[PDB]
Amino acid sequence: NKRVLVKFSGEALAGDNQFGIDIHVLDHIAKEIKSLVENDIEVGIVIGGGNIIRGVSAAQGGIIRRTSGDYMGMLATVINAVAMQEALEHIGLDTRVQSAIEIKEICESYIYRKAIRHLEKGRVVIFGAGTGNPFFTTDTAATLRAIEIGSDLIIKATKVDGIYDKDPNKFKDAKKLDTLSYNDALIGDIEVMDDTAISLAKDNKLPIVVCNMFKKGNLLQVIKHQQGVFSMVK
Amino acid sequence: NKRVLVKFSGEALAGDNQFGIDIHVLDHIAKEIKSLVENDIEVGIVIGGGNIIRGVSAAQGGIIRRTSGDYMGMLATVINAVAMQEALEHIGLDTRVQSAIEIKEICESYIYRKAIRHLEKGRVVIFGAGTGNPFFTTDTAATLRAIEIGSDLIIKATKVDGIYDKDAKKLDTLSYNDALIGDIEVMDDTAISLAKDNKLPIVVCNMFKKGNLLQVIKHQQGVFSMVK
Ligand SMILES: O=c1ccn([C@@H]2O[C@H](COP(=O)(O)OP(=O)(O)O)[C@@H](O)[C@H]2O)c(=O)[nH]1
């Protein structure tokens, strides 16, 4: 019934180091997904590739074109998706990776009715390579998939409790914002997602939720009970 | 007329770090490749993925199946290949990436006859995804691609000048069996046997000394160790 899209930056998979994949961190995440699946919540997941490679970072040397740097990023998300698939299935869950870039040998291609059939049979669906367009941020791609599958909400999983007024690291006086309007997110200096993603979520009336997942049982509490610790853009 | 396969470990492209892609290193390699192309040497490149993911490391703990780890590693090689291509195209080299695993939108598949065709036209071919099979090594993949394209030799580009006994001497020439028997490792056993069976010489040399590669291929000089 309740269908959600959980979005992670690649860094979520890395832990204390900025690079790679921390196996312990991965298992932890998968167990938070498992609690959703056990409570009959349908879970789509998108993951960025920032733990492996970045668009404005590999291009700044002066020899990697903008599009090729993105294609490197897209391949990275597929690497992360396979890892996540494995962590999910290690703990007994059924999962499919639906990639926007065709790699038949490693995962299924994204097809609208296939992703839905999987979700309706209770499989976790991980969307690899966003939507295949290089120009889009992870946030935009996740919001797109979230609309495409008719999700009830999109969860942006971060390392921080929710949406704040200033960066919690750069300010002691940083105050968490519990509920925000789409426009409050657009005009204000504070950042949630990029402008395209927020505007996409606004027009299609998709609620955005920003929460920590380091907290055991929080995700379930957020999705099923509208409880736990989170921020909501509505 | 001379044809060559050059093998890089993923770790090689990471530079002064264990992880990632060093753009100064890729530039350096592109220049060396350029000197081969401009001297009419046909160049195939096989690139590793260890700077990003290795399947063995990935399977520790038993969360990721060894097989899925190896595919993750094979994808990482395509990422390196793509960055390698951009470094080459940047200095005006015509290149093609071919992957043992089909990634339709980003590069062409490995096709025996096309690879050769690209090389006849003076293009650099970068082979990603190794053999396309898990459980095999970059060394094996490189040796395979080398024999497939009809290489005059395979060059294992490493950080060291040649083959040594420790990380107290350097070893100039080696038999295939000497490489299969001894504690000194050049590549893994399956790559060496593949090379032996097909009479394919193996050069081990340093990637960082300028003009060296050109001298090994064109003149059989410069600094290097040889398994034959
Ligand atoms: O034919 C292949 C080629 C590579 N790989 C995987 O991808 C990585 C290759 O990159 P690496 O840099 O490690 O080669 P090496 O460093 O060992 O020379 C390996 O760890 C393997 O898990 C594979 O499974 N089959």
Q: Assess contact for B125 and B115: CB atoms under 8 A.
A: yes
d(CA B8, CA B216): 16
> DSSP characters for A45-71?
EEE--TTT--HHHHSTTSSS-HHHHHH
Cβ separation B83–A72 shorter than 8 A: yes
Task: State whether residue B75 sits within 8 Å of chain A by CB.
Answer: yes
Tell me how long chain B is: 228
3-class SS at A86? helix
For a substitution probing ligand 1, which of B6, B54, B75, B127 has the most ligand atoms within 8 Å of its CB? Answer: B54
Annotated binding residue A161: no
d(CA B115, CA A92): 43
Å from CA of B54 to ligand 1 middle: 6
- Quoted resolution (Å): 2.5
B26 contact residues in A (CB cutoff 8 A): 63
* CA of A98 relative to ligand 1 center, distance in Å: 25
Distance CA B176, CA B227 (A): 6
Q: Is B44 in the pocket of ligand 1 (CB under 6 A)?
A: no
Tokens representing residue B47 in the block? 């690139």
Domains of chain B: 1-228 (3.40.1160.10)
List the single residue in B23, B101, B106 with the smallest CB-CB distance to A101. Answer: B106
B77, B188, B190: which to mutate for ligand 1, most atoms within 8 A of CB?
B77
Q: Specify burial of residue B225 (Cβ count, 10 A radius: 0-12, 13-18, 19+).
A: buried
CA A131: distance to chain centroid? 13
B10 assigned ligand-binding residue: yes
Question: Which residue, B23, B26, B72, is CA-closest to B50?
Answer: B72
Q: What residues of B are in contact with residue A104 (Cβ under 8 Å)?
A: 102
CA–CA min distance B7, chain A (Å): 21
Contact A64, B83 (CB under 8 A): yes
- State the Cα angle at A187 between A182 and A191, rounded to 5°: 75
Expt. technique? X-ray
**Number of neighbouring beta carbons within 10 Å of residue A172:** 7
| Parallel, antiparallel or unpaired: strands A124-128 and B202-206 | unpaired
Q: Do B63 and A21 touch (CB under 8 A)?
A: no
**Spatial CA neighbour of B204 closest among B160, B167, B165:** B160
**Ligand 1 atom with the shortest distance to the CA of B49:** 10
On whether the CB atoms of residues B130 and B138 are closer than 8 A, the answer is yes
What residues of chain B lie within 8 A of the CB of A102, using their CB? Answer: 102-105
B71 labeled part of a ligand binding site: no
